[PDB]
Amino acid sequence: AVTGIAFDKNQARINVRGVPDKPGVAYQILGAVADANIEVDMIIQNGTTDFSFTVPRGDYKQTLEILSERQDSIGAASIDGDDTVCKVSAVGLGMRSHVGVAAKIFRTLAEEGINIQMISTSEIKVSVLIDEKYMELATRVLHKAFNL
Amino acid sequence: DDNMERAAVTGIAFDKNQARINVRGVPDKPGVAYQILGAVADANIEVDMIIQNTTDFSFTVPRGDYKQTLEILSERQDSIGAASDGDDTVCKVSAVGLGMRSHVGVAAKIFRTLAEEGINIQMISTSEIKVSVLIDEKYMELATRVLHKAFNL
Ligand SMILES: [Ca+2]
Ligand SMILES: [Ca+2]
């Protein structure tokens, strides 16, 4: 089911707030980001809507400046971010089958009172964005929770 | 951008066998999110696209398990801090990211195509490993055609 726990501090969250819910919006945000050729990892979305995504920590300032200038188009209420988050992953080949992973990791991080900001799942991995100060804790909590 | 070709699973999946649950009105006192999902996982329902953008939880379930999820979360809704709705006319579009050098070109494209046809993205949920979105099931054939065209299948 779950064979390893990975973690990675090279993360920055970026938020685009209260953007009109029309087609083409997502593209506008990302396309801007992808022509500065910065990689983007997680993306999360939803008469308004909110668009959160992750950027390698080193691209935090540029991304905010790319969106600051394209805030005209897009037309967002606010643009903020967080460069003190990190990603922690439950990883294991042979997994999609086992269903209570999202739940279990939520449950276990909940006990330690550590807020999950974002989640993404797949056959191969399940990942959460949390504040960096929880990284070790979360890794250890989860590592325990899955018997190594 | 050769990335779609590099994908190991080169393609876009369309799943009309899905339904969106929106658990509305949730307070921020102890691990309430778990009672939500553990209740769904105990019934052995598989879950995907968990979002929390003072804030609500939203997710997807195979369509054949919607009438059950709704009820499992219904008779536990005044046991969990819960004010309120689901949606069983959604279709999930997804591409798998393992193998791709970059994943953002593909995602921005996927978004651009749907935009050009006036198809609105209901929910996004993507990472290095999978790029997935939610659109209205009425656009499924249209989405398949324009997306197949855009990535040459
Ligand atoms: Ca800072
Ligand atoms: Ca912090």
Side-chain angles (χ1 to χ4, degrees), chain A residues 57 60 82-84:
Chain A
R57 198 165 286 179
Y60 187 47
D82 186 348
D83 53 353
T84 66

Side-chain angles (χ1 to χ4, degrees), chain A residues 42 44 87 118-122 126-128, chain B residues 125-127:
Chain A
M42 287 158 110
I44 297 281
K87 174 184 210 178
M118 295 187 197
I119 188 163
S120 70
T121 53
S122 64
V126 171
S127 321
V128 288
Chain B
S125 175
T126 92
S127 63

Side-chain angles (χ1 to χ4, degrees), chain B residues 16-21 59-63 66 87-90 134:
Chain B
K16 92 195 291 161
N17 176 29
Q18 303 273 348
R20 169 193 190 162
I21 279 98
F59 55 107
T60 62
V61 149
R63 204 166 271 168
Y66 165 66
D87 183 5
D88 60 323
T89 71
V90 298
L134 220 70

